[PDB]
Structure 1
Amino acid sequence: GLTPQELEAYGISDVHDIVYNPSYDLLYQEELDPSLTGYERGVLTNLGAVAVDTGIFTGRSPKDKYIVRDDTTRDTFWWADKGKNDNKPLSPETWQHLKGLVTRQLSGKRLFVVDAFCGANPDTRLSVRFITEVAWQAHFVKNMFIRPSDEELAGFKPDFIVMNGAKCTNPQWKEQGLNSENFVAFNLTERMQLIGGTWYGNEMKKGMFSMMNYLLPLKGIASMHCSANVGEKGDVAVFFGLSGTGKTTLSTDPKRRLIGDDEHGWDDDGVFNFEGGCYAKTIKLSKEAEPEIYNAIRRDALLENVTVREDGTIDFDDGSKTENTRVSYPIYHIDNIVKPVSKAGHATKVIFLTADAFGVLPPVSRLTADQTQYHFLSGFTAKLAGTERGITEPTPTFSACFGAAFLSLHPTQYAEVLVKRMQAAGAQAYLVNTGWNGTGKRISIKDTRAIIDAILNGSLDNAETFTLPMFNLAIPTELPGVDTKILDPRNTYASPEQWQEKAETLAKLFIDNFDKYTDTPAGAALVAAGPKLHH
């Protein structure tokens, strides 16, 4: 695929061993090499999958994310210093120092080079070349990106390079005004991502997602943090939501063909996956509740940060290394998928998932057109942050478009293209609370799946509704397979008064958050679709 001389063109010198397009069999034996030390080491589990520890980082490091500010990006990027976001500006000169750190780190090493695609469609996909010195990092990108055919490899021409220098750090970070010795940096003039300090594989996956989020909407294509699936009739659904809200869990549905679990575009022909694999959360994983995900954990899946007992069994309940235990697998580890290309027609059902730790929002509501835009821009979820200290400190997150950490353009640009696509398809939107109600427990997966079924088969559209105060959400009066009591969140408190107190707290949070969008005529008009609180 490439010679040591081609790598020298990238700045990487004296590479003696090049592993181009490593096979799954080679990656397995690389990860289990008994002479490996530290965080490169894998262990074989009784399910047949290799498990690794990703080091000090067990999630992304948004405080270390930087984008070079130059004549290509200055007037188009959504900059952190010009709404809150992580797109912090970096100079071209400082970029050159970070590039030197990474290229020197990879020089004189045995390198894995993985060529892959981001985007299922040839007309808009990125041809990405990933370079790493850690086998399980190469395995991660083999699982998560689209694996080219032999014919596509023969004429592969990268238009983005990702250089993973996890083992290096930046000793000049203080004088350079950066956050730490680690860095995840992007340059759209050179079309490159550099990683230093963090080994975490998802920096590469979400890094390329951020690049698609820059390029696609500028060409009229929606770029979405959502899962997607399709029914027997060809009816497509997309599921937006922040991390942990259910996109992967609920899209992996035995009644539907999976398109993808996390990153999709929506062009003139329909909805298409960016990825070649899925990246499931494994904390407290239940084979009974999530059988398809559980079954995908086998040879060629890559487990991250799980606890493996001495006998090789996995303690999926153990969050000691992190609550964000994960498994990646190529998408064909799921039985019922769209193939050979992960794409389908236009979505007619658009589901916003949220996990409301305030216990206010109903399990399901059908949204008006204006409420759809209001809630898309708000991008709400919440967490019980204080659990380890024995308290419910519901902590809100408002992350525009249900994925602000990955947005490269202003939120209104994603909203505009999404609305355009939804209006052309006649799509309807729904808000689903996969989180908490007055019981202080999350709604069960079984009940949420039944809610999703009722959305997808048209049942919910055919129901009578009542209106929830404050948020003015249309809720169905009944739904097949779900206890009617929980459809109204007020019923899970000893009295509507307990819900009302929490609803007022949450409404104020939404109203304060939305204020930043009211600087345009269209945004000010959307306030009427948000929660109403005047006392």
Structure 2
Amino acid sequence: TPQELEAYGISDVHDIVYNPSYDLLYQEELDPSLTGYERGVLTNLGAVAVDTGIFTGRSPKDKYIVRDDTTRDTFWWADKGKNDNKPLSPETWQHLKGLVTRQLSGKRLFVVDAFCGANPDTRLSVRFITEVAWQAHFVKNMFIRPSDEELAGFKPDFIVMNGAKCTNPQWKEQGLNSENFVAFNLTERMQLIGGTWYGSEMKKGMFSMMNYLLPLKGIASMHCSANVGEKGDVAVFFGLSGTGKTTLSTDPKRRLIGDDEHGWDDDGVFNFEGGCYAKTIKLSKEAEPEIYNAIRRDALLENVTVREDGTIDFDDGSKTENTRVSYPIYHIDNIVKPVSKAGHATKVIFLTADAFGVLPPVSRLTADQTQYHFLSGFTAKLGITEPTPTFSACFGAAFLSLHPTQYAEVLVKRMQAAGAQAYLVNTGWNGTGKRISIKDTRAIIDAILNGSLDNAETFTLPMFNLAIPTELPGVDTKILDPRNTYASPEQWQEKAETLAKLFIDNFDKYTDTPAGAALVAAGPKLHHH
């Protein structure tokens, strides 16, 4: 009812589109009278493509959490290690809520009810409100779509109000970063968005809320993909953006659980989402056939270049390198169903893209190295190279609402109970200045998952002290030692000392506890220069 929407503060809504169907979203997006960033275009693959506007990725500098008596003593605050949980006053929150609700008043609104979390006992019932059809399409794809029975008794736990078309004229007076905002209030259980149209703010916004609620009751909440083999063996793949979680979990030899957000409770690993959000830059049908074949009607392409004849130039990063496609998870042929969950993970894989070309393609981690590298959360990026490091705790600090050690504690507990083994995989660069091929990386993953490596003979990489298998079927043995891809081990050593120092400085903040101090021994060792 409009009276219900009025309770949220939204007035005078003339048209309400509740639970829009995929067919209706399709015709909404292709309405030939739409102008601006609402407009979609039809590609020859059958999927609609849209432009997300000035924002082609998340805006962490615009993310704020209301600091009140619910969040004061439990949240990981940016002003109290480096994170994006910047404190917001309740008073300023109310002005922001006024901006969004006024913007959505007097509009035709899409209302999408969905779940975050595959399990009833821990899921959030989220109600999304937007005036942009492709934003409703995004959340229909990425969250769990309820059954008709579940919709009948749907009671929202959280409300997400997307006011992308409004901006905040008072941001200077309020001490905020810009006229845009992505704000959360755990007392009202609400997310507000202004200025940025980018859909994934809602996806990662609710992920951040799961990351707050689940560990506080003993459930790991993880930035990982996950899949399961025929023998019932579950694997999770942690990693930062672009390191290969979606690419590598979408494997026809295994049943996909999910590609990005999972919990781990007493029964096992469960997906938070109802879809996958794949990168499309330079997408190769031969290298990633399952992802490519998911691009069809009801998938939603973002910021790709579409030619006059409707074909897609997947290689064109002119608008952004972060070209994306969302699709409901059943667009992948080999998935777990009807519920995206499975048992306890026994293989835990940390993906990293090492632009420094130091780390080996695959290492088998000790228990302490697992905690050290989990808290470190390393990746790096590249007419100059300039390897630029990122240390993002738990491979997802941008989404952590509690302190990193709280995620580590619950993860270790779940791993120990399951007898899980951890591995570090460099999906990035070596001495060639090229990325390891997807073919080689998939073969590495195969060798991890089939037990090939759990007792294989190893040699130890200096300084990082990582155990590397001496051989691995399907991979050229030469590349297993990263020193072999340089003219001499001396070139590698110089870059390794740079990276080791980066790790050591970054890890210092964790040494104010005895447990954290103890983990220094498992990290890289550097005592000169």
TM-score (normalised: structure 1): 0.99
Question: Matches of 2:217 and 2:310 in 1, distance apart?
Answer: 49
Q: Residue 378 of structure 1 corresponds to which residue in structure 2?
A: 376
Q: Residue 493 of structure 1 corresponds to which residue in structure 2?
A: 486
SS of structure 2 residue aligned to 1:462: coil
For residues 98-157 of structure 1, the C-alpha deviation after alignment (integer angstroms, 9 at most, x for no partner) is 000000000000000000000000000000000000000000000000000000000000
Question: Matches of 2:455 and 2:76 in 1, distance apart?
Answer: 41
SS of structure 1 residue aligned to 2:423: strand
SS of structure 2 residue aligned to 1:99: helix
Question: Matches of 2:481 and 2:253 in 1, distance apart?
Answer: 27
Question: Matches of 2:39 and 2:317 in 1, distance apart?
Answer: 20
- Which of 360, 384, 396 is residue 389 of structure 2 equivalent to? 396
Question: Matches of 1:35 and 1:344 in 2, distance apart?
Answer: 46
SS of structure 2 residue aligned to 1:60: coil
For residues 317-344 of structure 1, the C-alpha deviation after alignment (integer angstroms, 9 at most, x for no partner) is 0000000000000000000000000000
- Which of 38, 47, 55 is residue 36 of structure 2 equivalent to? 38
Question: Matches of 1:245 and 1:221 in 2, distance apart?
Answer: 25
For residues 249-280 of structure 1, the C-alpha deviation after alignment (integer angstroms, 9 at most, x for no partner) is 00000110000000000000000000000000
Structure 1 residue 432: Cα displacement: 0.0
Structure 1 residue 224: Cα displacement: 0.1
Q: Residue 436 of structure 2 corresponds to which residue in structure 1?
A: 443
Question: Matches of 1:263 and 1:348 in 2, distance apart?
Answer: 18
SS of structure 1 residue aligned to 2:54: coil
Structure 1 residue 492: Cα displacement: 0.1
Question: Matches of 1:191 and 1:40 in 2, distance apart?
Answer: 28
Structure 1 residue 210: Cα displacement: 0.1
Structure 1 residue 461: Cα displacement: 1.4
Q: Residue 513 of structure 1 corresponds to which residue in structure 2?
A: 506
Question: Matches of 1:516 and 1:247 in 2, distance apart?
Answer: 27
For residues 229-253 of structure 1, the C-alpha deviation after alignment (integer angstroms, 9 at most, x for no partner) is 0000000000000000000000000
Question: Matches of 1:12 and 1:120 in 2, distance apart?
Answer: 30
SS of structure 1 residue aligned to 2:225: strand
Structure 1 residue 460: Cα displacement: 1.1
Question: Matches of 1:361 and 1:67 in 2, distance apart?
Answer: 36
Question: Matches of 2:345 and 2:252 in 1, distance apart?
Answer: 19
Seq. identity, %: 100
SS of structure 1 residue aligned to 2:454: helix
For residues 259-317 of structure 1, the C-alpha deviation after alignment (integer angstroms, 9 at most, x for no partner) is 00000000000000000000000000000000000000000000000000000000000
Structure 1 residue 223: Cα displacement: 0.1
Which 5+ residue runs of structure 2 have no aligned equivalent? none
Question: Matches of 1:254 and 1:472 in 2, distance apart?
Answer: 34
Question: Matches of 1:283 and 1:343 in 2, distance apart?
Answer: 29
Question: Matches of 2:386 and 2:100 in 1, distance apart?
Answer: 41
SS of structure 1 residue aligned to 2:432: coil
Structure 1 residue 347: Cα displacement: 0.1
Q: Residue 222 of structure 2 corresponds to which residue in structure 1?
A: 224
- Which of 241, 248, 267 is residue 269 of structure 1 equivalent to? 267
Question: Matches of 1:142 and 1:405 in 2, distance apart?
Answer: 23
Question: Matches of 1:440 and 1:298 in 2, distance apart?
Answer: 35
Structure 1 residue 374: Cα displacement: 0.2
Q: Residue 465 of structure 1 corresponds to which residue in structure 2?
A: 458
SS of structure 2 residue aligned to 1:460: coil
* Stretches (4+) displaced over 6 A: none
Structure 1 residue 463: Cα displacement: 1.4
SS of structure 2 residue aligned to 1:357: coil
TM-score (normalised: structure 2): 1.00
For residues 376-395 of structure 1, the C-alpha deviation after alignment (integer angstroms, 9 at most, x for no partner) is 000000000xxxxx100100
Question: Matches of 2:273 and 2:454 in 1, distance apart?
Answer: 32
Q: Please give the root-mean-square deviation of Cα atoms over the aligned residues, in Å.
A: 0.3
SS of structure 1 residue aligned to 2:97: helix
SS of structure 2 residue aligned to 1:461: coil
Structure 1 residue 462: Cα displacement: 3.1
- Which of 76, 79, 91 is residue 78 of structure 1 equivalent to? 76
SS of structure 1 residue aligned to 2:512: coil
- Count of matched residue positions in the alignment of Structure 1 and Structure 2: 528
